[PDB]
């Protein structure tokens, strides 16, 4: 080499016959579950080709579609997952530049997933091999709009929050009484039993807010006096739950709920329980009013 330097002779065999998808899953909240789900990928022929003796129409392949998969474990890493596009057993009769088109399935939506709408133009790069004697896919490029890059898929998880307010009124209402209360939330395919959720608890005064768990499938037990609350702060989408007061009527105590979603139909219950409510995009807000009188 040079000097200090040392010449290296070898070089990195990038395989032209294979082609990395990249996908990742952003977070609207940092803190959110990851669903049991696949993305999948479909690469096909471009169309859209003029073909001369240069450019060519895609060879179709035996497999066009690849997937990755997520499941609750990957929580709290990068998810990013990759797959591969197998283009080894492809037949390229001559030298040229094939054109496929690269985009992400989205069929089986996942509920709480904005899917990535991008289109990846593919160029196969097939040129004639020296010491093989014959035409052999070389290099690969994708682009979207002009810049050569990695072909790369980024779906949105968002996710959503569950607020329950205990508001004590009438004349006769204790201002200082702890209320008890159960919230379920189920089990679904993309959220298996067990799994964790984070619960902020409000007071009224000088305390900040106090952290809990809740399992999936596990009831939660938790009280409130009257302008406290709870707020399960990472609450997936598509997930089914119940909240309950206890009974106070013996302690002539009155009970109704309001349920109501951010930009939604607000209902009003009387009697100590939601029904069966399941999560959507919008911030949930039920509030137990505990009404007592002479």
């Given at each position: 080499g040079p000097g200090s330097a040392t010449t290296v002779h070898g070089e990195t065999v990038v395989n032209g016959?294979?082609?990395?998808?990249?996908?990742?899953?952003?977070?609207?909240?940092?803190?959110?579950?990851?669903?049991?789900?696949?993305?999948?990928?479909?690469?096909?022929?471009?169309?859209?080709?003029?073909?001369?003796?240069?450019?060519?129409?895609?060879?179709?392949?035996?497999?066009?579609?690849?997937?990755?998969?997520?499941?609750?474990?990957?929580?709290?890493?990068?998810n990013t997952k990759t797959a591969e596009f197998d283009f080894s057993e492809?037949?390229?009769?001559?030298?040229?530049?094939?054109?496929?088109?690269?985009?992400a399935e989205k069929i089986d939506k996942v509920p709480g997933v904005s899917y990535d709408t991008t289109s990846y133009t593919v160029q196969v790069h097939v040129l004639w091999n020296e010491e093989q004697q014959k035409p052999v896919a070389t290099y690969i490029v994708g682009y979207k709009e002009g810049s050569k890059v990695p072909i790369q898929f980024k779906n949105s998880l968002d996710s959503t929050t569950l607020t329950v307010k205990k508001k004590?009124?009438?004349?006769?209402?204790?201002?200082?009484?702890?209320?008890?209360?159960?919230?379920?939330?189920k089990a679904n395919q993309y959220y298996k039993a067990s799994e964790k959720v984070m619960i902020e608890k409000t007071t009224k005064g000088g305390?900040?807010?106090v952290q809990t768990e809740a399992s999936i499938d596990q009831l939660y037990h938790f009280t409130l006096k009257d302008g406290e609350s709870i707020k399960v702060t990472n609450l997936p989408v598509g997930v089914d739950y119940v909240v309950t007061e206890d009974?106070?009527?013996?302690?002539?105590?009155?009970?109704?709920?309001?349920?109501?979603?951010?930009?939604?139909?607000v209902k009003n219950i009387a009697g100590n329980s939601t029904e069966q409510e399941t999560s959507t995009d919008k911030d949930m807000t039920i509030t137990f009013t505990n009404k007592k009188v002479f």
């Open positions: 016959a294979k082609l990395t998808v990249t996908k990742n899953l952003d977070l609207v909240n940092s803190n959110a579950l990851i669903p049991n789900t696949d993305f999948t990928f479909k690469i096909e022929p471009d169309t859209t080709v003029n073909e001369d003796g240069n450019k060519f129409k895609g060879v179709a392949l035996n497999t066009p579609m690849t997937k990755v998969t997520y499941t609750n474990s990957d929580k709290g890493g990068s492809v037949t390229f009769e001559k030298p040229g530049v094939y054109y496929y088109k690269v985009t004590v009124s009438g004349t006769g209402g204790d201002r200082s009484k702890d209320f008890n209360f159960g919230l379920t939330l305390q900040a807010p009974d106070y009527k013996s302690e002539k105590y009155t009970t109704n709920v309001e349920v109501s979603p951010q930009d939604g139909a």
